[PDB]
Amino acid sequence: TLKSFTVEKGIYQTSNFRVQPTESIVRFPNITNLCPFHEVFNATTFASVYAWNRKRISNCVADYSVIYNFAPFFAFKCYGVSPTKLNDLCFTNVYADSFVIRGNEVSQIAPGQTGNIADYNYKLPDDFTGCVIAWNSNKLDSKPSGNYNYLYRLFRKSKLKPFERDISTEIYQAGNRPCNGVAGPNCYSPLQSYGFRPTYGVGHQPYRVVVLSFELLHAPATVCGPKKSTNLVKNKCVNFNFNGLTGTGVLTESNKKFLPFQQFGRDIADTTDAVRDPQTLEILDITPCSFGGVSVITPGTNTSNQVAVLYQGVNCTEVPVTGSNVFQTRAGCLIGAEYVNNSYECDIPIGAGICASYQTQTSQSIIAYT
Amino acid sequence: RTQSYTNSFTRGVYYPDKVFRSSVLHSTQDLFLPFFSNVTWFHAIHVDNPALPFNDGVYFASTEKSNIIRGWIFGTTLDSKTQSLLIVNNATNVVIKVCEFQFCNCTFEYVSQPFLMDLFKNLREFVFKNIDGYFKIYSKHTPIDLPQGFSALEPLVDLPIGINITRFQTLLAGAAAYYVGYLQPRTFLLKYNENGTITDAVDCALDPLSETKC
Amino acid sequence: MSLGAENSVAYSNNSIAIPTNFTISVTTEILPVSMTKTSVDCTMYICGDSTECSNLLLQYGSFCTQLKRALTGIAVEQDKNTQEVFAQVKQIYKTPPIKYFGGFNFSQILPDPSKPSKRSFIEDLLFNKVTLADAGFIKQYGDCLGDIAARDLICAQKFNGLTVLPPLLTDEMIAQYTSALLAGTITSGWTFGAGAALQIPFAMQMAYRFNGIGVTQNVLYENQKLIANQFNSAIGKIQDSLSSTASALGKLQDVVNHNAQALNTLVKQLSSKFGAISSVLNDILSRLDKVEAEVQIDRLITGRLQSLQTYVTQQLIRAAEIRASANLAATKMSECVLGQSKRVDF
Amino acid sequence: STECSNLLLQYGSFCTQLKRALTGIAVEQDKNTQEVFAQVKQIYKTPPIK
Amino acid sequence: AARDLICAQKFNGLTVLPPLLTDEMIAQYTSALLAGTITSGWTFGAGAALQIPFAMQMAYRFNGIGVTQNVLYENQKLIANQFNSAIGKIQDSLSSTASALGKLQDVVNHNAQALNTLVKQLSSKFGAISSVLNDILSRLDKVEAEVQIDRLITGRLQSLQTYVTQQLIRAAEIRASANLAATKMSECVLGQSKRVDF
Numbered sequence A: 001t002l003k004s005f006t007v008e009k010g011i012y013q014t015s016n017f018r019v020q021p022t023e024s025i026v027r028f029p030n031i032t033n034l035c036p037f038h039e040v041f042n043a044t045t046f047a048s049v050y051a052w053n054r055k056r057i058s059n060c061v062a063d064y065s066v067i068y069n070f071a072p073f074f075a076f077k078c079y080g081v082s083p084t085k086l087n088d089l090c091f092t093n094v095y096a097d098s099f100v101i102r103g104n105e106v107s108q109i110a111p112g113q114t115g116n117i118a119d120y121n122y123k124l125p126d127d128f129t130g131c132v133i134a135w136n137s138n139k140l141d142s143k144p145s146g147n148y149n150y151l152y153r154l155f156r157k158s159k160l161k162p163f164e165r166d167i168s169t170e171i172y173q174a175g176n177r178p179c180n181g182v183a184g185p186n187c188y189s190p191l192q193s194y195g196f197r198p199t200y201g202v203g204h205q206p207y208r209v210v211v212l213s214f215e216l217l218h219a220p221a222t223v224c225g226p227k228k229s230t231n232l233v234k235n236k237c238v239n240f241n242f243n244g245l246t247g248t249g250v251l252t253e254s255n256k257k258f259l260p261f262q263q264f265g266r267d268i269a270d271t272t273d274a275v276r277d278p279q280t281l282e283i284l285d286i287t288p289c290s291f292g293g294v295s296v297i298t299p300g301t302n303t304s305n306q307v308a309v310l311y312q313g314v315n316c317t318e319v320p321v322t323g324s325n326v327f328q329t330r331a332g333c334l335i336g337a338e339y340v341n342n343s344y345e346c347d348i349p350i351g352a353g354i355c356a357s358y359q360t361q362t363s364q365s366i367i368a369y370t
Numbered sequence B: 001r002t003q004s005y006t007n008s009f010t011r012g013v014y015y016p017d018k019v020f021r022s023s024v025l026h027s028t029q030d031l032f033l034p035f036f037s038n039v040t041w042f043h044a045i046h047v048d049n050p051a052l053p054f055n056d057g058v059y060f061a062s063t064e065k066s067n068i069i070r071g072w073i074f075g076t077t078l079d080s081k082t083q084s085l086l087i088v089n090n091a092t093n094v095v096i097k098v099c100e101f102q103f104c105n106c107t108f109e110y111v112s113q114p115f116l117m118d119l120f121k122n123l124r125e126f127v128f129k130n131i132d133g134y135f136k137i138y139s140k141h142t143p144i145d146l147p148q149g150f151s152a153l154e155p156l157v158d159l160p161i162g163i164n165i166t167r168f169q170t171l172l173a174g175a176a177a178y179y180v181g182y183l184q185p186r187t188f189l190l191k192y193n194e195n196g197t198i199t200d201a202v203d204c205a206l207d208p209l210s211e212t213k214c
Numbered sequence C: 001m002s003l004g005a006e007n008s009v010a011y012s013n014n015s016i017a018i019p020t021n022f023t024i025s026v027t028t029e030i031l032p033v034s035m036t037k038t039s040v041d042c043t044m045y046i047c048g049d050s051t052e053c054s055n056l057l058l059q060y061g062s063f064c065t066q067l068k069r070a071l072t073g074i075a076v077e078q079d080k081n082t083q084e085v086f087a088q089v090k091q092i093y094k095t096p097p098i099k100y101f102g103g104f105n106f107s108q109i110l111p112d113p114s115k116p117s118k119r120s121f122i123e124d125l126l127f128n129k130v131t132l133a134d135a136g137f138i139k140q141y142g143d144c145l146g147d148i149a150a151r152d153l154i155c156a157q158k159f160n161g162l163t164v165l166p167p168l169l170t171d172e173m174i175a176q177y178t179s180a181l182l183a184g185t186i187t188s189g190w191t192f193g194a195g196a197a198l199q200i201p202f203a204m205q206m207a208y209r210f211n212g213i214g215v216t217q218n219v220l221y222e223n224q225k226l227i228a229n230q231f232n233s234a235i236g237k238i239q240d241s242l243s244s245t246a247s248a249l250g251k252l253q254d255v256v257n258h259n260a261q262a263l264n265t266l267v268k269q270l271s272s273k274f275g276a277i278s279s280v281l282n283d284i285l286s287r288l289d290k291v292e293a294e295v296q297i298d299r300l301i302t303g304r305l306q307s308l309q310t311y312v313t314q315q316l317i318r319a320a321e322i323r324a325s326a327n328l329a330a331t332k333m334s335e336c337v338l339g340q341s342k343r344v345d346f
Numbered sequence D: 001s002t003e004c005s006n007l008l009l010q011y012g013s014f015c016t017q018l019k020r021a022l023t024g025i026a027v028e029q030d031k032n033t034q035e036v037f038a039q040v041k042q043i044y045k046t047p048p049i050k
Numbered sequence E: 001a002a003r004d005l006i007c008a009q010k011f012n013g014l015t016v017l018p019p020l021l022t023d024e025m026i027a028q029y030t031s032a033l034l035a036g037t038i039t040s041g042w043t044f045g046a047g048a049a050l051q052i053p054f055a056m057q058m059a060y061r062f063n064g065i066g067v068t069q070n071v072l073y074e075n076q077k078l079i080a081n082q083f084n085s086a087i088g089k090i091q092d093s094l095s096s097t098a099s100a101l102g103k104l105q106d107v108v109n110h111n112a113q114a115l116n117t118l119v120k121q122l123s124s125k126f127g128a129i130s131s132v133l134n135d136i137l138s139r140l141d142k143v144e145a146e147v148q149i150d151r152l153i154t155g156r157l158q159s160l161q162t163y164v165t166q167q168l169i170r171a172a173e174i175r176a177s178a179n180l181a182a183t184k185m186s187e188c189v190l191g192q193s194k195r196v197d198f
């Protein structure tokens, strides 16, 4: 730690000791159902972008590796999460929105976009934490005579709020002459259909879009992954996986006053203090494992190689496993220097009126004194 | 109708999240009822226009000891066209409906414990908020007009309904008397005690003294 | 604001004013000497037992050795400041059991054996007046590891690698230095500040002080009882002022509050996101792949390193100010306790 | 700018530290001027005879 | 038609607070100190003011420096003429050369150039495409403008922290000089100093 081969006399803070975890536990709820992504992707027909569907997925085990078999897409477009890490963590509520748009309009299914779909048809929130799946469908959404069943809106008085619908069919009145249903030169119907032919280029072909929305939250989890659980162990430095959060610490029983709706606790530094077990409704504190600082008291390297090691701040019944003589000091536990009843000048300072020195006894050794 | 006006005092405090905090002074920005605001007092007497605009959150309160309030109806319009929420209480269970059938083809149904647990004055408080398609319901039962003090409201009931709400009314089984308060985006300073509940709060945009406190 | 009362001295070229009586008065001067010694670990603060964050921190640079060296130098400077101010006497002197110092009481400043810590009445009042926080290793890793219904800031800063080192000299040794200095001052005068301590009666020492300030020594020997009563009343007024008013020690209290608020700000800077998706490294490492979590972890590492460097620079500036105040206090101890000073208003 | 204000609020709490440091500096200079010049308890005046 | 730097720093949030004591109050303090010194001597720094003729006061000063007081009373007119000529020479030296107040002028210049470079740091791109936020909002969408705004925020925060650190160091130096000035006022105006070259 000094980047040298010779060490002078004094005290040096070298490193920090830690207690390593022993076991690893996983705590997931008691859910055995399977999430029907099959009914979402394997479907005969989809809905229009102005009347997009929304399927609630809840109380099931979600496997996201079977999505690739249902539809022939290229890759996920995930915001906030990664598509390969969707099985090691889990949410509370998952939705699925299905609609059919054009190939130029796929880029408007991103958060923060402004356009035609992203203003008047389907607006995503700027804090989106989900994935967008889109693939070409030119064999089931196109006809040689014409597939006119897919509709979109060009005219609206205002812009859509995120995650809202408007399926009303009223005649838009852009002009100053009221018509109340007369499609004249100033009134137009704001509902036009795509003229899908198979003989287009790659940009104007229909595309099927499935948008997944995730709700990682302090609510109890209902949609989770295929990972088995582990029996709970207390009063031991372990690694825990309580509903998708990973940490290292000691779990003890609590005398806290958690309300029935509250499921987590937090610290001033915004780290988790208490967590609720999903299987049995009990509260466990998260206390980090034993740590501290290690200081090395040595004389000169030309003098001797005897080393006294001080663990800063702990008592000697808390040490995990240096030297042989064990002394208690208000600065910490000093191991390797015997305590004499005499008093001399301070050679190497330790703290709280305690000094150390390399002196004889009759046989050279390190002593500690007031 | 008998429209009247009353100070709000400090009766618009609710829990902003589901995270336990103890002995921590916390600052939150959410739709809150401002301190010393103006609530509207209504006296519905039937031998009146109960249509009121939503305007981003509604604080509801009633001082009636007897169970004479059955529930509420919401929605933009009530001509059996769009989805309109409906709460029916009969002192045995709660009934929630979404379909456009008004008070005498439904997607979401919800049956749970009734909202009137208690049968003193038994002041009841309700906060209805519609943010991100969720109908958040906050309630608190205070055995004691609006008194002086604090009573935080717990998010015990949530609805994934996802509709548009502009108007709202109440349901009667007339000597009703209820207060209506409106929510505005404000910043508070909530104080948690050792037991983890909210006991004091400071509205940061009321007077310069509370701005100094925040 | 009013600058003061209006006055006009009656000046003439054949008029003088000469006092006919005196007044013995005792004042109080409070000076900071040392401050809290802190030790900061980078791996617990920036990363907190995360292996990926530790690897990117090792890949980043070597700022942490510089911060550790700066904080170690500040701690040794604090110990040197305390040793320079207080340890100025070669031998621990002792008062005789007879406490008749020419009619002067000296009981409120001399120690008593009733308390386990040999401190006087005024020292006890001064120690009880300061609400000391972060006194050293008082938690001793036992209260923080247990279950507390209301966690304090001490365990919160303890779990994030922010520790406080105890001072080298305990309060008993500081009280022993102060008692030795007081015993040498009463029993010797200024003779113990040059060589060996030479005894002298206290009335003759006070006559030497009056000859030092320009007054002939016959004034004291004819007015000894009045001067002793004035000194006793001044000591009693000092006792009453230190018992009633609690705003006099607002330099030491400000030092304690500044160290506490600096540590609290350093703890509260851990909750910031710094442009990342979250302020927790575990949520970032679970929610993302390798490259994106590397980007967010690098952003959080940069933000926490900037916060730690700001804390270290502010601590260095405060340590320089405290060292200047300790040098002033050591000069005052050398010039006014160990001798009579001719400097005006010093 | 609203977006810059939101990102600066999302950034951290350096600005309260900067404001606290500058306020302490200004109070320190006022204390410096007071402790240099205000050393006399009463405002004396010279007689008209000079 | 020609905007000054004061409006340029005022429009960017950089203000200057007035001192608590105005120049009239400082002049009154120095006038009270001068009146007490030339009327009473050092007696107004210990207790109440004690009047004394100025010849006896200068005899006290000569007895302080080690000269018997009969030297003054036999050479009073010569010493008075020498003092008046010395004050006239101070007047001539202050009217001729303006470089005596270089420390105060350097303090003013340092503060002015610190505020000027803090204003001039706002014209830097810091790696972004533009140094102005409005063109970043207008040209780009949300995602790219967030990155460019974050870069500009980091650069301006670093510049502000550098300014605050330099101001802290300069304030510590100014406080040390103020402590020296207060010690000089306490020991040399309120009394006679035996320290060499103080």
Ligand SMILES: *[C@@H]1O[C@H](CO)[C@@H](O[C@@H]2O[C@H](CO)[C@@H](O)[C@H](O)[C@H]2NC(C)=O)[C@H](O)[C@H]1NC(C)=O
Pocket (backbone or CB within 6 Å): C105, C106, C107, C108
């Ligand atoms: C020196 O001062 C102490 C403190 O005031 C005196 O002790 C007090 O004595 C009176 C009368 O004996 C008691 O009523 C008080 O309770 C004592 N106070 C304390 C704090 O002990 C002491 O008497 C003084 N010395 C002399 C010689 O009078």
Ligand SMILES: *[C@@H]1O[C@H](CO)[C@@H](O[C@@H]2O[C@H](CO)[C@@H](O)[C@H](O)[C@H]2NC(C)=O)[C@H](O)[C@H]1NC(C)=O
Pocket (backbone or CB within 6 Å): C020, C021, C022, C023, C226, C229, C230
């Ligand atoms: C000088 O001042 C002291 C007090 O500062 C005077 O002492 C007081 O004298 C009165 C009248 O005899 C007594 O009632 C008080 O008890 C005395 N006080 C003390 C503390 O002893 C003293 O008389 C003054 N001397 C002259 C010559 O005026």
Ligand SMILES: *[C@@H]1O[C@H](CO)[C@@H](O)[C@H](O)[C@H]1NC(C)=O
Pocket (backbone or CB within 6 Å): A029, A030, A279
């Ligand atoms: C819930 O989980 C516990 C875990 O042991 C299990 O015993 C229990 O049967 C589960 N409940 C249901 C309804 O499956």
Ligand SMILES: *[C@@H]1O[C@H](CO)[C@@H](O)[C@H](O)[C@H]1NC(C)=O
Pocket (backbone or CB within 6 Å): A041, A042, A043, A044
């Ligand atoms: C999707 O799943 C159904 C089973 O319900 C299957 O018959 C069909 O061939 C699959 N593929 C498509 C493109 O529909």
Ligand SMILES: *[C@@H]1O[C@H](CO)[C@@H](O)[C@H](O)[C@H]1NC(C)=O
Pocket (backbone or CB within 6 Å): A314, A315, A316, A317, A318, A328, C140, C142
């Ligand atoms: C350390 O452990 C011992 C044994 O339990 C205990 O008595 C003591 O109080 C603890 N703390 C210190 C500072 O010694």
Ligand SMILES: *[C@@H]1O[C@H](CO)[C@@H](O)[C@H](O)[C@H]1NC(C)=O
Pocket (backbone or CB within 6 Å): B005, B006, B007, B008, B037, B038
């Ligand atoms: C509410 O507003 C009305 C006027 O609209 C006013 O008369 C009444 O005093 C207000 N209530 C208060 C301030 O409590």
Ligand SMILES: *[C@@H]1O[C@H](CO)[C@@H](O)[C@H](O)[C@H]1NC(C)=O
Pocket (backbone or CB within 6 Å): B105
């Ligand atoms: C049922 O409700 C839907 C809208 O939710 C509506 O379109 C439909 O017409 C309703 N059915 C009948 C028979 O009214």
Ligand SMILES: *[C@@H]1O[C@H](CO)[C@@H](O)[C@H](O)[C@H]1NC(C)=O
Pocket (backbone or CB within 6 Å): A161, A164, B076, B164, B165, B166
């Ligand atoms: C609700 O309907 C109104 C029209 O009554 C419309 O202006 C508004 O955009 C809709 N959506 C909301 C408030 O989210």
Ligand SMILES: *[C@@H]1O[C@H](CO)[C@@H](O)[C@H](O)[C@H]1NC(C)=O
Pocket (backbone or CB within 6 Å): B193, B194, B195
């Ligand atoms: C917390 O709850 C306990 C349990 O009844 C109670 O004794 C205590 O007074 C409560 N604390 C406060 C501050 O009211």
